Amino acid sequence: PKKPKEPVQVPKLLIKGGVEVLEVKTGVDAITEVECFLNPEMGDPDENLRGFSLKLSAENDFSSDSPERKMLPCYSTARIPLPNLNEDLTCGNLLMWEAVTVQTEVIGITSMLNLHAGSQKVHEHGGGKPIQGSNFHFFAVGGDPLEMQGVLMNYRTKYPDGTITPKNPTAQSQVMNTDHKAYLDKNNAYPVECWVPDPSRNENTRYFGTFTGGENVPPVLHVTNTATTVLLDEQGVGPLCKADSLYVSAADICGLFTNSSGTQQWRGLARYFKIRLRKRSVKNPYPISFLLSDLINRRTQRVDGQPMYGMESQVEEVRVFDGTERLPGDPDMIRYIDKQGQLQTK
Amino acid sequence: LYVSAADICGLFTNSSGTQQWRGLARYFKIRLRKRSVKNPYPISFLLSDLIN
Structure with a gap:
């Protein structure tokens, strides 16, 4: 009996398991894979009807429009x-976790086939109406929280107080405005109709999203566990994790669902991730005089002196003698450094 | 150096029968010395705390 052909080398599994696996001492070329999901927070009108919105307000004033908190979709974050x-490492190099490859896949897509779930009757003796209308899908992977932009419409609407809205809207806020920034740090309070990602600031995340508005369009879903979405930039680095944290934020709205009396309401589903990780060799950016800067300032007493910084200074004149030279036939001269060279006026 | 101790040494008894607890002091003696180790936290981990 001849021996078989010698097999093909693959990377070696070392530990599978729960969340307590990350604490393993590995070598240098360690790579991990983290499978995680997120809950959708669509509003939850009671405890019994998890994952929905409440029944919609049909027509209010453009001025006195006052929704409640139980009918707004929100961004899910973790x-x-x-x-x-x-x-x-030597010479101040560090090692931080890089998030190379994401792979998203929507969970729960065939719940919408259940037509006998209290819809309004579509014709004479027909079945139930499926979910159709405006869909929305959005996810984000990065080492920093998703720094997002303030945009809203109809600034004269009075939000409820469970939500975090942009502060002090004007009519100018309905287009690109600067003074409506926020971070994303609180689940089920950031509404979907009031925030989009800021294209200016996020050097460290990667957000993907698409939108289709409509009275009645089919929601198209696409499920495959061989798709692979790459997260590299032009230089070859993904999201770095500055602090040891990994911020994953996502939100999904599938469409509009009609109840038994004929009221449309919203629908959200979960979302799956699989972030692959690795160790990068980075260098130190900040100077050496940083640790001490804070260490002294948390031990020495606070002094309420007579001030010496800013427009209320009481220093008259400062001089910096350095090196030597010949006698200057004028002692009342003034010498300084303009931008790179040594200049001297009268 | 965290030294902690507890001593309960029986039951003193009163005159009308009401018992109550009693304990005494505890001496200690420690013979310290100077032990070598290796630095557990290089300044990298010392640096990451400020960002956090």
């Missing part, structure tokens, strides 16, 4: 801790 790379 934070994954990571363990330290407590390592031994």
Whole structure:
């Protein structure tokens, strides 16, 4: 009996399991894979009807429009801790966790086929109406929280107080405005109709999203566990994790669902992720005089002196003697440095 | 150096029968010395705390 052909080398599994697996001492070329889902927070009108919105307000004033908090979709957010790379690099190099490859896939797509779920009757003796209308899908992977832009419409609407809205809207806020920024740090309070990602600031995340508005369009879903969405930039780095944290934020609205009396309401589903990780060799950016800067300022007493910084200074004149030279036939001269060279006026 | 101790040494008894607890002091003696180790936290981990 001849021996078989010798097999093909693959990367070696070392530990599978729960969340307590990340605490393993590995070598340098370690790679991990983290499978995680997020809940959709569509509003939850009671405890019994999880994952929906409440019945919609049909027509209010353009001025006295006052919704309630139980009927707004919101962005779902979460934070994954990571363990330290407590390592031994020379000349101030560090090691931080990079998130190379994402792969998203919507969970629960065939719940919408259930037509006998209390819809309004579509014709004489027919079945139930499926979910159709404006869909929305949005997810984001990065080492920093999703810094997002303020945009709303109809600024004269009075939000309820469970939500976080842009502060002090004007008529100018309905287009690109600067003074309506916020971070994303609180689940089920950031409404979908009031925030979009800021294209200016996020050097560290990657957001993907698409939108289709309509009275009645079919929601198209697409499920495949061989798709692979790449997260590299032009230079070759993904999201770095500055602090040991990994911020994943996502939100999904599938469409409009009609109840038994004929009221449209919203529908959300969950979302799956699979972030692959790796160790990058980065360098230190900040100066050496930083640790001490804070260490002294949390031990020495606070002094309420007579001030010496800013437009209320009481220093008259400062001089910096450095090096030597010949006698200047004028002692009342003034010498300084303009932008790069040594200049001297009268 | 965290030194902690607890001593309960029986039951003193009163005159009308009401018992109550009693304990006493505890001496200690420690013979310290100077032990070598290796640095557990290099300044990298010391640096990451400020960002956090």
